[PDB]
Design a protein around this ligand. Structure first.
Ligand SMILES: [Fe+3]
Ligand SMILES: [Fe+3]
Ligand SMILES: [Fe+3]
Ligand SMILES: [Fe+3]
Ligand SMILES: [Fe+3]
Ligand SMILES: [Fe+3]
Ligand SMILES: [Fe+3]
Ligand SMILES: [Fe+3]
Ligand SMILES: [Mg+2]
Ligand SMILES: [Mg+2]
Ligand SMILES: [Mg+2]
Ligand SMILES: [Mg+2]
Ligand SMILES: [Mg+2]
Ligand SMILES: [Mg+2]
Ligand SMILES: [Mg+2]
Lengths: 362, 363, 363, 364
């Protein structure tokens, strides 16, 4: 399969396909089909069929993205024409967030981690056969079980070298902050395959959705997603994970972008005083961003004064911001209208093209 | 070379708590970590500089008669020798060091800086061997290791686990993942490789609340609540199939009480009869794992209203797998002369005091 | 430090048979074993001084055109380079040394003196690395070890298994116990620890007759009969749950043919659907182990009467787990230019020549 | 458990007694999965036969016709074993060798091809014989069957119960898949020596090979006389492999392999070694020099030469200190201590066969 080529089209770092009903069954062992029929996929809830914050308005999907039968993102033809052709996407990165007709219930978060591994492997076989190889404008970010590194390492070794794969896919929420040594074998395996890692917004993880209680209303739930990414960035940087893995690239997907700038600013300021706690950390904290931390754009930040967007994106790192649409979610961003009227044209071009080309090794 | 432990006329005491005198760990700690501790203390799963989330009540939870001239109970090796080892003819006394200093329960392995945790575990292990075990090998060490960082724990088990002064690996009852999780399997593998069993002692911390349904308020809730963590760990270790992967691993629950395990296991089997289809990989019936894999120490002894129920429940658990402990110098210390009810059978009392622990510890 | 293998424009050849020149192993053998060989030869499971129980037919079963100026086919590294590596652009060629001298098939690991066998395996490994691999690292070694004495095999895997010139551990298709037996588990453990897969090459010997129902008479029976041992080994490795214990272990059956594995596995599943209750601990359906654990090399390529059936059966086995081999310099050598039928799909052949072997060897 | 060491006073040693569990007596000691497995499959071994071994017994199961209790198989009634054997012959150390999990003569637990089942049956047998027989009447002591063909499981069982004072030996079979000097078995020898336990190898069928080195026998004379051959082969391997150089305190007894034939076997071994010893240059002693410290043999079924004086000659040519009395109760060729030896047999040799020799083997 040839390497991805981006020339006059664009990069889209976050696309959500969904398998049609039964589409994963050719790839699952018999024991897991039986298990799912009898138990469903238990996770960090007391609920049979939904997550703890079920989608609010029409499944949080584009009203115009429902096909003849099935869920938005389950129709390959509609995805080719409504997304890939429409916006001339030449590298579109698939992030499968659910094994079935659902918006968000990640395979890696099944509490039966052997089932989780089986669902991740089936998703990877499915997306490569059903989407990537038939139309290699798409490439896969492969879900793995971050909470069981041995299984994730196995899956990265199995398919990580496939030219259809461009990243390893995790979740924004975890049981330990991602700088923990628990996850280091996954980083090691990813670097060995020259794969970057994308962490997509998730529920679950094992803790409440904030550091100070479970949220009540939808504003709190959705705005609160940024908090997990703030916590993860701090851990990955301050733990020295990037001293251990100096080539490891990480992208935060659907965590927003602008907030990272003042977070990193406060991180440096605090470190100037308190650095003595972490004497093995080799660089000033913000010095890790350019080489290690990326963010995708959707849902685009919308300051009251539009000029503040480019300022904050550059205060984060202008080279490390990568366009995404989030097709087919309701807060989908269109490359023709996402950026504010006065946004600098050269920054926009690299967000659409060069920045993601660098992140994915194009 | 230190001789193997020998139990002839004396008894096994599976849980004794020494503490290092002030400064006693400093020879075994690098200056970077000594400075760290001076500035930051041993930060753990609390917002408190020096104490844990449930500080002890009356007198530090220590026996009122166990205080040396100066220092904390358990810090004077001569007083431990005369008030405990000599007094009760303890010939295998297993040390479980629960704090790096003059405190009751602040385990080194639970420091959130896991590099500091590993350094403190290492220092504790060198200290207890040099200061207590080698001078008086009636004592032997259960070595604290960092269960939450398996690589560091494995390194420590490799470093010191084969020393004849060590008889077990020491963990905590509370953990971030239940102990049957694959996370901990490298520790089980290393322990088996060194022919060591594992003891899990009552702890605070772990990362979750002290119950599965909120943090407790009063001391009755806190102290009675320690049993709950061990119920949860037993279920995880058994149902996960950990003992199918490690068919020679022996684990003891220390200071989780004993009798409650019997009806827990009984409910486990009864539920499994219906729901076993969820866990088709598990090789044996759940209760069948107990005899070869799960031990419990006795302190604080269960005290039923009708004392005859004690022996019944210990046998319903597994009479061969119950091991005596005193918990010296804690306030609820059990004296082997007075702990057993009058009708208790001699066969069970004798193996609790000697043979059962000899089997667990490989003596 | 030897670079990792790199397969770009060329191919993987999973089975190449070099032979030491006369005396070439002597620098790597202790004088005691030199003396033993002079006085006893290499006694194995025969009553024969020099040959195995089924000696080769025409020309030693070697290619008529593979004889160097002096010595046995495979004994001249320059002819190996020009007639094999250069001729077919082999970029990962895996050496399987089947004899310590100028013979076709007399494996070191099968010497009945297992101390001698271990010394010959060690000497073969030092020799092939120094004479062949390091001078031309398109070649890499599958290291013979003594499967019938696991302690010695483990020692040799520890000694040389991490060398970058080594890509696999080498065993024999015939053994005294089926390969899923716990006897061989220490070897699987050591191989996994060195991130090494295992290749089992066609062999005579083992301790049993060459079929499960008597010794064969004619060469058709002997040579077609080699498939049988691999069928038996696959069944044991799968049904024993060896891959439940070692979930990262990869094994390749070398020169057992490929297509027959598909109906064998199909029968295994169909029988297990009824009889699975005998082995309730096996975690997966039997055929489900193939994809993650069982590979097969292609030579001598299966030749169905209707060529279309080849691709069908290779895919019914597992198309990602089939790896090219030439078997140079044996008479039934497969040329990668001609081995596959005209209509065979390019993607499947490409995987067989490149990606599949790269995955198996971790390249 | 706690139990005095055996005391042999005015009584005798009996090195081979065959008890058998009554129907169901092992079930309290077996996991549910193995009870189910046995119900559904029986105990598969190296045969194509559901219920019998490849050479089933000829006449009445090869039991003496007077040892049948009210209900069970011979050897299944503890009271009958006490009065018919231990009381009757003043046996003060009677060593139990349980050869079957049930009333089915000669079917060793260790030879089940499912070695996890085999281990479970060995463990159940050990728990049962200690509880039902040894502890109630400690004149009896156990030779604990273990799975020789799966050393990890055997080592575990030796570690589990091998230090129990009710146990006096580890119990194996005369036939194995590899000769007993093979390194495969060395972990078992290591674990046995660590528990200061000797090993007894009892006559068996099975093993994985034919019952001779040159084909399967046809008639019962060939089968029963053929049992000595396996012991000949095992002695040669154990000695010539240097197993006793590696384990210099290891003691082994061949049980029910006869005695006299060992003498000329060893004699031929030395004579051959004098020429060919260069093949095995590490061996520390002349082959026959291993016997005194390492190899014992029990007497039953006693050798019956045509001229009785040859018996004592051959027993001394083997090693007079290393011959140990056994009855083989309740099998048909049972030997009685009062009549087994020829009238002219030396009294000093007989006394040590009945007492001193076995005391030294079992560490009494
Ligand atoms: Fe998204
Ligand atoms: Fe979204
Ligand atoms: Fe305590
Ligand atoms: Fe306490
Ligand atoms: Fe070959
Ligand atoms: Fe060949
Ligand atoms: Fe007998
Ligand atoms: Fe007999
Ligand atoms: Mg600045
Ligand atoms: Mg300053
Ligand atoms: Mg540094
Ligand atoms: Mg390697
Ligand atoms: Mg198993
Ligand atoms: Mg099962
Ligand atoms: Mg003993």
């Amino acid at each position: 399969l040839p390497a991805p080529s981006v020339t006059t089209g664009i990069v889209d770092a976050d696309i959500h396909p969904v398998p049609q009903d039964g589409a994963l069954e050719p790839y699952l062992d018999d024991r897991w089909k039986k298990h799912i029929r009898e138990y469903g996929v238990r996770t960090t809830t007391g609920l049979q069929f939904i997550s703890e914050y079920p989608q609010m308005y029409g499944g949080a999907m584009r009203a115009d993205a429902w096909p003849e039968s099935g869920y938005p993102g389950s129709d390959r033809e509609l995805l080719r024409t409504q997304l890939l052709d429409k916006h001339n996407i030449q590298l579109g990165v698939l992030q499968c967030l659910a094994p079935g007709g659902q918006t968000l219930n990640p395979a890696g978060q099944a509490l039966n981690q052997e089932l989780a591994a089986a669902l991740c492997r089936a998703t990877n076989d499915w997306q490569l056969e059903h989407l990537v190889y038939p139309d290699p404008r798409m490439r896969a970010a492969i879900p793995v079980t971050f909470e069981t590194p041995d299984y994730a390492v196995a899956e990265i070794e199995r398919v990580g070298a496939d030219p259809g794969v461009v990243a390893v896919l995790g979740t924004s929420k975890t049981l330990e902050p991602l700088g923990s040594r628990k996850y280091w074998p996954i980083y090691e395996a990813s670097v060995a395959q020259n794969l970057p890692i994308q962490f997509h917004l998730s529920q679950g993880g094992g803790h409440a959705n904030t550091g100070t209680g479970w949220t009540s209303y939808h504003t709190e739930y959705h705005t609160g997603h940024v908090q997990s990414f703030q916590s993860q960035l701090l851990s990955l940087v301050l733990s020295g994970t990037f001293d251990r893995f100096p080539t490891l690239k990480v992208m935060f997907v659907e965590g927003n972008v602008a907030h990272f700038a003042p977070l990193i600013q406060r991180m440096d300021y605090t470190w100037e005083t308190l650095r003595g706690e972490l004497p093995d950390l080799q660089r000033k904290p913000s010095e890790y961003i350019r080489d290690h931390i990326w963010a995708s754009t959707q849902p685009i930040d919308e300051p009251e004064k539009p000029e503040h967007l480019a300022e904050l994106l550059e205060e984060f790192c202008g080279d490390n911001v990568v366009f995404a649409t989030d097709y087919p979610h309701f807060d989908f961003d269109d490359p023709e209208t996402a950026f504010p009227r006065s946004f600098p044209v050269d920054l926009r071009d690299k967000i659409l093209r060069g920045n993601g080309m660098r992140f994915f090794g194009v």
